[PDB]
Amino acid sequence: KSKLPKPVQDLIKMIFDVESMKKAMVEYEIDLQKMPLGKLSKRQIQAAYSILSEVQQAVSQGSSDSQILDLSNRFYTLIPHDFGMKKPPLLNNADSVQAKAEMLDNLLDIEVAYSLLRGGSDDSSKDPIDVNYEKLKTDIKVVDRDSEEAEIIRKYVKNTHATTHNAYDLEVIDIFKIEREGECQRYKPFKQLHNRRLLWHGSRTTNFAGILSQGLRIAPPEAPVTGYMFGKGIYFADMVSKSANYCHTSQGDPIGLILLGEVALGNMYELKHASHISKLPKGKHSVKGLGKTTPDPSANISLDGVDVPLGTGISSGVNDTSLLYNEYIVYDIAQVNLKYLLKLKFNFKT
Numbered sequence: 001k002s003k004l005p006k007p008v009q010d011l012i013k014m015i016f017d018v019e020s021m022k023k024a025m026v027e028y029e030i031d032l033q034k035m036p037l038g039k040l041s042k043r044q045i046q047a048a049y050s051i052l053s054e055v056q057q058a059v060s061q062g063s064s065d066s067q068i069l070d071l072s073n074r075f076y077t078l079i080p081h082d083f084g085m086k087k088p089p090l091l092n093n094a095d096s097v098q099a100k101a102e103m104l105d106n107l108l109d110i111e112v113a114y115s116l117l118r119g120g121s122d123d124s125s126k127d128p129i130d131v132n133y134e135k136l137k138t139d140i141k142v143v144d145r146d147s148e149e150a151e152i153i154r155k156y157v158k159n160t161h162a163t164t165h166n167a168y169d170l171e172v173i174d175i176f177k178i179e180r181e182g183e184c185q186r187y188k189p190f191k192q193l194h195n196r197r198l199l200w201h202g203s204r205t206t207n208f209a210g211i212l213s214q215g216l217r218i219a220p221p222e223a224p225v226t227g228y229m230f231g232k233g234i235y236f237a238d239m240v241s242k243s244a245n246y247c248h249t250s251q252g253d254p255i256g257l258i259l260l261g262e263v264a265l266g267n268m269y270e271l272k273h274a275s276h277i278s279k280l281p282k283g284k285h286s287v288k289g290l291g292k293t294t295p296d297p298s299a300n301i302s303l304d305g306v307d308v309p310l311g312t313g314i315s316s317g318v319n320d321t322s323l324l325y326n327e328y329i330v331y332d333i334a335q336v337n338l339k340y341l342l343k344l345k346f347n348f349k350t
């Protein structure tokens with residue numbers, strides 16, 4: 001039986017839940033009879049991205065239908081859905097390819113996880129929890145409730161959570177210190193770079209095995225650019241309110257996970273509107289999307305050299321911005337050092 005702590009073990013069970021995988025799929029209207037979990041493939045997901053990019057181009061050009069129809073059939077041939085009747089939705093706009101792409105991102109992480117939860121020696125010497133834990137290649141330690149670290153984190157979560165979107169309330173059930181294998185010697189060279197901050201990154205639970213196992217990644221070339229406001233990179237927030245929205249929780253499954261990463265921002269290229277870049281200006285090492293709301297700068301705290309902007313949310317200088325919350329994008333996976341992972345309960349006000 002595992003020597004790990006209940007909170008950690010329970011974390012393993014969460015990120016490796018098959019049901020959750022089939023749930024996220026069925027929720028996507030994916031036919032589990034035509035496309036069961038095991039059938040999922042990386043190549044297949046690549047091809048699908050490519051089709052979606054062709055649709056974007058078609059949509060942008062103003063393709064004379066049929067071609068927009070043939071591309072739609074193609075995508076639904078690759079990704080088997082069950083509509084029954086009324087026919088599948090036509091992918092003929094930005095909105096459609098955007099959503100279809102977000103799903104492929106998720107489906108990708110599910111394949112990564114299922115491929116892991118099914119790979120390796122499935123013997124009976126070590127217990128399932130221990131085996132799986134290893135597959136993650138991540139050191140997971142529980143952070144004491146009554147500790148300076150926990151105190152800080154809880155304050156960061158409490159302050160950056162407001163009422164203008166008070167559709168729910170946040171409860172920190174567990175906080176873990178995390179250190180992925182490799183993520184250290186890879187980040188080292190970037191630590192010798194100013195503007196290092198502790199930012200948020202929320203994601204569906206089903207994507208966490210792939211995140212811990214392979215770290216946060218950047219969309220592939222084949223992936224359509226629509227949706228990525230500031231190009232293909234890694235996105236973070238300084239307010240749990242913006243990040244917590246990517247955990248996609250509901251009163252049905254009120255529990256989600258959210259990361260806390262130390263990001264070497266360097267000199268930030270500040271923008272107020274979407275802008276595909278990837279290629280920053282000389283001297284710029286990241287992008288900062290200016291939001292209408294920022295954490296009170298006077299409340300900024302630090303440690304080790306990492307700034308924690310846990311100050312309560314105030315109104316930034318600019319409202320001429322399209323963004324409501326700030327956004328931080330880095331285009332090099334090594335500019336990120338994941339530090340903590342939180343298990344949070346979302347209490348919806350309804």
Ligand SMILES: NC(=O)c1cccc2c1C(=O)N(C1CCNCC1)C2
Nearest residue numbers: 200201202227228235236237243246
């Ligand atoms: N994940 C986060 O915490 C997060 C935080 C801030 C902004 C964004 C994300 C995120 O994931 N964003 C997506 C990027 C891909 N295109 C859809 C939107 C934008």
